[PDB]
Amino acid sequence: SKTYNYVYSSDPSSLNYLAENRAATSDIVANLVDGLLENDQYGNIIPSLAEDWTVSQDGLTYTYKLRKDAKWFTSEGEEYAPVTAQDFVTGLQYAADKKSEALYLVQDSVAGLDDYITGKTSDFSTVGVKALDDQTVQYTLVKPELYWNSKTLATILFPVNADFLKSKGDDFGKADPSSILYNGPFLMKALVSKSAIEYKKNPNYWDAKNVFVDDVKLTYYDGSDQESLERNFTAGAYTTARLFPNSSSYEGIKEKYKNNIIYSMQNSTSYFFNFNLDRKSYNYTSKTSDIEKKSTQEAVLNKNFRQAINFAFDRTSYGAQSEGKEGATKILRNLVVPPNFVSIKGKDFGEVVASKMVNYGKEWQGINFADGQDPYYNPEKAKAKFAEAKKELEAKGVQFPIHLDKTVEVTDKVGIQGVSSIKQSIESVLGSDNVVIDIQQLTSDEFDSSGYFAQTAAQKDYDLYHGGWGPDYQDPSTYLDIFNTNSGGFLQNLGLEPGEANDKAKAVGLDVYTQMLEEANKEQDPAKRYEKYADIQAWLIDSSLVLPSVSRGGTPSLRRTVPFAAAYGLTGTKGVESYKYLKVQDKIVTTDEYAKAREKWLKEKEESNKKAQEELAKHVK
């Protein structure tokens, strides 16, 4: 038997792929449930449960033909029932009925779905998903979406068996392998909080031939023993290992593995810092007075203040805490939309955003948004912006310094160094008589419930947050919509609730931002549409409501995985998240072997993408 062994860091709150928008859930379910389409090794969208599909000439009707040999299985591997088109009707009705946190992916796209979710109608037969027969599912959209098929790689568009769902009721989708049915490459054999996630290859999966490992075992990793990754790799227990050049052990590791260290490419997941614009919870704070809390509440609404923090935040120093001195810039990401995410007549998105910055003030003159460098850090600009913020805030009675709470997990030693670097950088540039970053070290449970797994904006217990977005579909709106005041998926992390559009959101212009998103979304020509989203991304950078930080990837590893065997996707949950396609080998890959494979993959990706674009036209009516 061939096994992949490594670690995981995030336990899921549930397995409810229809109701969750957290990667903690979809990273797991990517291995357990398939949707209509998936990815190949090159990022092409290829058949999954749907063996064929058509789109109408007006772009509003998508029809999918499901393969007859796809079945649902229990967690023990027993066949439950064939997959049918009705399962996609069931899945969408359930996502709507449960008010899924990912409803923004479909609520404004599928005909009638907004009316049903919001109570304008009560009958799901008016919603644009239909099972025409057992093998044929048909979606009806409100407007054309060239990116619609990419959306089927998001879990809210995955199927569910209605009888199983009914039998389970509120038990459906709990963090228990028996809470869902399986139609994907693996069965979940173990899901143990703070201990293990274990997958077993499903021998009767419709595409079992493309699953090259029989078992996947992930041991819980809390960040307290970073040397354990290479230690267990070298002992033969892990298949891969992420290296930490700051560790005392790195000198010896690099001498042993001089020809084996492999750096991954930066990918489309973007991280950024944001502020809590309407903080309600103060369990984790170093502030002791209402004047301090009100002073911070006022400061985070002040644009000059946010820009001063932006220009005082040394991203190189931050990156160096995990990547070491020489690799410090390899992870840096300077927009929310990756600069190469789309192109506009051959110009990259980030270049167009840079072009738009000329209208947002001298403080952005000459900015370059390329990955892998820090265009923000600028102490003299930061100090000048802060002086302006301080005059504005003092006129309101604000007391200085402004204390900003940032949380970190007590066991997460690299994360503690990261946040310590941001404290040092900001306080060094602006002065601790002006800003203090108060680091709150929390237990796992406290870190989870005040942050990523908080269920309301009111439970967010911090002034600064560091989270990120993985794109759900191939359009800049997947990133830029997450701050809109009507339905933004990231709004709670800013302390705001979708719908409200309250005084604080208006104070920082997020209502204007939301209106801009609405206008840009109406544009159907891709070049024009992308140009409008570039202006929207420029507005957001200028607003400094986000402080772009890092991406995933760009990091060193040792590997016994076969280079570029796995699936890859720019968006969705069927790429690197999936252990389908992945292969393991005995030999530790060399840097030179990886480089040769990378150049081969880069060349083949362009050829394959061109073929894929050709194949697309055969599907119109």
Numbering used by the authors: 32 to 652
What's the paper's own text on this?
Given the auxotrophic nature of pneumococci for certain amino acids, the Ami ABC transporter system, orchestrating oligopeptide uptake, becomes indispensable in host compartments lacking amino acids. The five lipoproteins exhibit pairwise sequence identity of ~52–60% and share a very similar overall folding.
The crystal structure of AliB (residues 28–652) was solved at 1.65 Å resolution, revealing a closed conformation despite the absence of pre-incubation with any peptide. During the modeling and refinement process, additional electron density at the AliB substrate-binding site became evident, likely originating from Escherichia coli peptides bound during the purification process. Thus, we modeled E. coli peptides (VMVKGPGPGREST and PIVGGHEGAGV) previously reported to bind AliB. Although the electron density map clearly outlined the backbone of a nonapeptide, the side-chain density exhibited ambiguity in places, suggesting the binding of a heterogeneous population of peptides. Given that the observed peptide lengths did not align with the reported E. coli peptides, an identification effort was undertaken through mass spectrometry (see below). The three-dimensional structures of AmiA and AliB revealed the capture of oligopeptides during their expression and purification from E. coli. Surprisingly, our analysis identified a total of 356 distinct peptides bound to the AmiA protein and 393 peptides bound to AliB. AmiA predominantly recognized peptides consisting of 10–11 residues, while AliB favored 11–12 residues.
